[PDB]
Design a protein around this ligand. Structure first.
Ligand SMILES: O=C([C@@H]1C=Cc2c(Cl)nc(OCc3ccc(F)cc3)c(=O)n21)N1CCCC1
Length: 707
C-alpha cells in the first residue's frame, strides 16, 4: 500500500461479561472522544485517508462535474400561513436553502430567513419550525455542526422581526402553538454534566413537554407532561385543527406505536398552568395513531392497529371503546398508506406506496370514498402542503432520472386540475433505462430491486456497480433524483441498484418485522442475494461491485463485508452502527432496541453477537479471498450514531485484516469536522463527500473517467 496504518494501542485487559459470554474490547478507549489518545487516532487516520483519495485523478474530475450538474434551482412546495405564502429555494449551490415570503402567489417574494448568514461555512441549519395559527409569528430550530441539539428562536412575521425568546436544551422536539397565539409546546432534556454540543456521547433520558409563553424567559416555562418512572418515554404535542385539544403522542422507542392522550383545553381550570388534565384515550404501545383531523369529538387517525399496511379510523371521544371505532378507509391488501392529510375542510389527500412507488389521491372526509387520482410518473412524493383551512394543495415529485417538480391543484374547482407549478438539469433521461425486478432471497421471499443504467449495455459482467440498501426502521427506499449517482453512470460507466430489503416499510409492518430482532439476519441475506443477482444476471462481477449504506445501512454493508467478503470489491459505510453490543449506551441509541434488541438481554445478545460488525471481523479462510476495500465516513458531531462506532471498527479491521499479508485492499476512515449524522449538511460538504466516495471507488477498482 502507498501508506502505513497508524499505531493503535490494544487494551488486552478490557473484557465485558454478557450473561457468561466474555467479549474483549481492546479499543474501548476510543469511546472517549475527548482524550488525547482518541484525538491522536483520528488525526493519524485522516492523514492516511486524505492523500489516498486526493491522489486519485478522478476526484477532481468528479468534483468539477458534480459542482456543474448539482447547480440547478431547487424549490420546495409553497405553503400558506395566514395571509402569506412561503417557500424554500436554493439558487443552486447555496450551502443552505433560504425561506422566502410573499403576499400572494403573483406577489414579489422576499427573503424571510436565510440560514447562510448564521455561519461562514453553512454549518448552521434549520431543524424544525412552526408558524402560529394566524401565521403572524414563527418559531424555528437551529442546529450547529450537524448536531441533533436545537436552539429554538422566534420571529414576528410582519417585518421579519427577531424576538428575544430563546429555548435551549431542545432535542427530538415537537413545536406546536396553541391557537390563542399565547405560546408554544416543545420538548427539552434536563441539564447534564459535560458537553451538549454533539461531541458528547451521553444518553438522552427524561425528555419533558414544556409550554413557552411568548415574551417570557424559558425559566418560566410550564411543565405539562413528564414521565419520571419511564425515562425513555417521549411525549410530543400537537393541537387539533379547531384548537380545542392537545393531542399527546407518547413514544418509547423507534417502534411505529404510540400512546395517545388528549387534553381538552376548555377543561383546564386556569389555562396552561402545570401538568394538564390528560385523558388517557389509548394508554398502551400496541399501535400507531397519527392525527389527521377532527369534527367535534370525532377524531380521524391513521393507524396500523390490526392493519400492517395502515388504514384510517374514526374514534369518537364520547364513545371511545375499540369495538365502536369506524373504519373510514380500510387497509389495502398490498398498498401501504404512507400518509394522509385533511385539506379544504372535507377532503383527504392519501399517499400510498405501490411496489415501492408513490401514488396520490383525493378522498371524501365523510365517507372515505375515492374522488380523484392525481396522475404521477414512477417515483416518490417528497413534499406536500395543504391544511384543513387551505383550499389548494402543492406536492413535490421526484424520480431517478428527472429532478423534483412541483404540482399545484386548486381544490375549490368543479373540475380538479393538477398542474405543473415549478419545473426545472442541462442530462438526457432518454439515454438511461430504469427497471424494477424481484429476486428471491435465501428463504424464498421475493425482494424488489431498482436498477438504472445506460441503455443498450451488454450484460457481460464488465460494468462497475453501486448497490445501495438500508433495511430497517420502517423506512422505505423509494426513487429520488441523485446527480451524484448519475455521474457514476455517465462518467464512470456504472450501474446503479437499490435493493428494498426487509426491515424497511415497503410492504408495511410485516416487511419491517421481517428484518428486526431475531430476524435481523434476513436484511443481510436479502442484500447479499441482491449482489448475487446482479452478478448472476451479468450486470457486474464481485471485484467491480461497490456496496453502500448509511446509518442502519452502514451496519448493513459492514455486516455483509464480514459475512461475504468475496462478493464485493468496495464497501462504503457512512455513519454506521458497528458496535451492536454497546449502541444502546449512547445518546438516543436506547431507542433502536425496538429494531435490534439490547445486549442486556441474554436472548438478544445471542442474536446481536452473530452479526455485530465490530465482533465479526475475521480473516477469510480461503487464500484467494481478502476483504474488500472499505471506507468508513463519519463526523465529529454525529450525535445520532456516535463516531466511536466507526473508530472502533476501523481499528479492528486494520489490526485483524490489514496486517495480513494477503490483504492489499485499503481499509480507511475519514472523520469530518463541523458535521454530524447528515441532516442539514451544507452543499459544499455534500459535494466533498460524494467526491470522496467516487474517488475511493475509482482508485480501488481502477475505473477510468469517461469524458
Ligand atoms: O436515527 C436513527 C433512527 C431511525 C430514524 C430515526 C428518527 Cl426519525 N429519530 C430518531 O431519534 C429520535 C427519536 C424520536 C422519537 C422517538 F420516539 C424515538 C427517537 C432515531 O433514532 N431514528 N437510527 C437508527 C439506526 C441508527 C440511527
Amino acid at each position: 500500500l502507498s501508506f502505513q496504518y497508524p499505531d493503535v494501542y490494544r487494551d488486552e485487559t478490557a473484557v465485558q461479561d454478557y450473561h457468561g459470554h466474555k467479549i474483549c474490547d481492546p479499543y474501548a478507549w476510543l469511546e472517549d472522544p475527548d482524550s488525547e489518545q482518541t484525538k491522536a487516532f483520528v488525526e493519524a487516520q485522516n492523514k492516511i485517508t486524505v492523500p489516498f483519495l486526493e491522489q486519485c485523478p478522478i476526484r477532481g474530475l468528479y468534483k468539477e462535474r458534480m459542482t456543474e450538474l448539482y447547480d440547478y434551482p431547487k424549490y420546495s412546495c409553497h405553503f400558506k400561513k395566514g395571509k402569506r405564502y412561503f417557500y424554500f429555494y436554493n439558487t443552486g449551490l447555496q450551502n443552505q436553502r433560504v425561506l422566502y415570503v410573499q403576499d400572494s402567489l403573483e406577489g414579489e417574494a422576499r427573503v424571510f430567513l436565510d440560514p447562510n448568514i448564521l455561519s461562514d461555512d453553512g454549518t448552521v441549519a434549520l431543524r424544525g419550525y412552526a408558524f402560529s395559527e394566524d401565521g403572524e409569528y414563527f418559531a424555528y430550530g437551529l442546529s450547529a455542526s450537524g448536531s441533533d441539539w436545537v436552539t429554538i428562536k422566534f420571529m414576528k412575521v410582519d417585518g421579519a422581526k427577531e424576538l428575544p425568546d430563546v429555548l435551549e436544551r431542545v432535542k427530538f422536539s415537537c413545536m406546536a402553538w396553541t391557537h390563542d397565539g399565547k405560546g408554544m409546546f416543545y420538548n427539552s432534556y434536563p441539564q447534564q454534566d459535560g458537553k451538549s454540543d454533539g461531541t458528547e456521547t451521553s444518553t438522552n433520558l427524561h425528555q419533558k413537554l414544556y409550554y413557552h409563553v411568548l415574551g417570557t424567559d424559558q425559566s418560566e416555562d410550564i411543565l405539562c407532561a413528564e414521565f419520571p418512572d419511564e425515562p425513555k418515554w417521549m411525549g410530543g404535542a400537537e393541537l387539533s385543527d379547531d384548537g380545542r385539544y392537545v393531542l399527546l403522542s407518547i413514544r418509547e422507542g423507534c417502534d411505529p406505536v404510540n400512546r395517545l392522550w388528549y387534553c381538552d383545553l376548555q377543561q383546564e381550570s386556569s389555562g396552561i398552568a402545570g401538568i394538564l388534565k390528560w385523558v388517557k384515550l389509548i394508554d398502551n404501545f400496541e399501535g400507531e395513531y397519527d392525527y389527521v383531523t377532527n369534527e367535534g369529538t370525532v377524531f380521524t387517525f391513521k393507524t396500523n392497529r390490526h392493519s400492517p399496511n395502515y388504514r384510517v379510523i374514526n374514534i369518537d371521544f364520547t364513545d371511545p371503546e375499540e369495538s365502536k371505532w369506524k373504519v373510514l378507509v380500510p387497509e389495502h391488501e398490498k398498498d401501504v398508506l404512507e400518509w394522509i392529510a385533511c385539506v379544504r375542510s372535507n377532503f383527504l389527500v392519501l399517499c400510498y406506496l405501490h411496489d415501492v412507488k408513490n401514488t396520490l389521491q383525493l378522498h371524501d372526509l365523510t365517507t372515505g370514498a375515492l374522488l380523484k387520482i392525481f396522475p404521477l410518473d414512477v417515483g416518490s412524493i417528497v413534499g406536500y402542503s395543504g391544511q384543513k383551512k387551505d383550499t389548494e394543495i402543492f406536492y413535490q415529485f421526484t424520480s431517478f432520472l428527472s429532478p423534483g417538480i412541483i404540482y399545484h391543484c386548486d381544490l375549490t374547482k368543479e373540475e380538479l386540475e393538477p398542474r405543473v407549478f415549478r419545473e426545472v438539469v442541462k442530462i438526457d433521461a432518454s439515454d438511461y433505462q430504469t427497471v424494477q425486478i424481484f429476486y428471491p432471497s435465501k428463504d424464498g421471499t421475493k425482494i424488489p430491486m431498482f436498477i438504472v443504467h445506460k441503455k443498450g449495455i451488454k450484460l457481460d459482467g464488465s460494468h462497475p456497480a453501486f448497490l445501495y440498501g438500508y433495511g430497517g426502521f420502517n423506512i422505505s427506499i423509494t426513487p429520488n433524483y441523485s446527480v451524484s449517482r448519475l455521474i457514476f453512470v455517465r462518467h464512470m460507466g456504472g450501474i446503479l441498484a437499490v435493493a428494498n430489503i426487509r426491515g424497511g416499510g415497503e410492504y408495511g409492518e410485516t416487511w419491517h418485522k421481517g428484518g428486526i430482532l431475531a430476524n435481523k439476519q434476513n436484511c443481510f441475506d436479502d442484500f447479499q442475494c441482491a449482489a448475487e443477482y446482479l452478478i448472476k444476471e451479468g450486470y457486474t462481477s464481485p471485484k467491480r461491485l461497490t456496496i453502500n449504506g448509511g446509518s442502519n445501512g452502514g451496519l448493513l454493508v459492514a455486516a455483509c463485508a464480514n459475512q461475504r467478503p468475496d462478493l464485493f470489491g468496495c464497501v462504503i459505510a457512512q455513519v454506521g452502527v458497528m458496535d451492536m453490543l454497546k449502541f444502546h449506551k449512547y445518546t438516543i441509541g436506547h431507542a433502536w432496541t425496538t429494531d435490534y434488541g439490547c445486549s442486556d438481554s441474554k436472548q438478544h445478545f445471542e442474536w446481536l453477537v452473530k452479526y455485530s460488525p465490530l465482533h465479526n471481523v475475521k480473516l477469510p479462510e480461503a487464500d484467494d479471498i481478502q476483504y474488500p476495500s472499505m471506507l468508513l465516513l463519519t463526523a465529529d458531531h454525529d450525535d445520532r450514531v456516535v463516531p466511536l462506532h466507526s473508530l472502533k471498527f476501523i481499528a479492528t479491521l486494520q489490526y485483524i485484516v490489514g496486517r495480513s499479508r494477503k490483504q492489499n485492499n485499503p481499509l480507511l476512515i475519514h472523520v469530518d469536522t463541523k458535521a454530524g449524522h447528515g441532516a442539514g449538511k451544507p452543499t459544499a460538504k455534500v459535494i466533498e463527500e460524494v467526491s470522496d466516495m467516487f474517488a475511493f471507488i475509482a482508485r480501488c477498482l481502477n475505473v477510468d473517467w469517461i469524458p
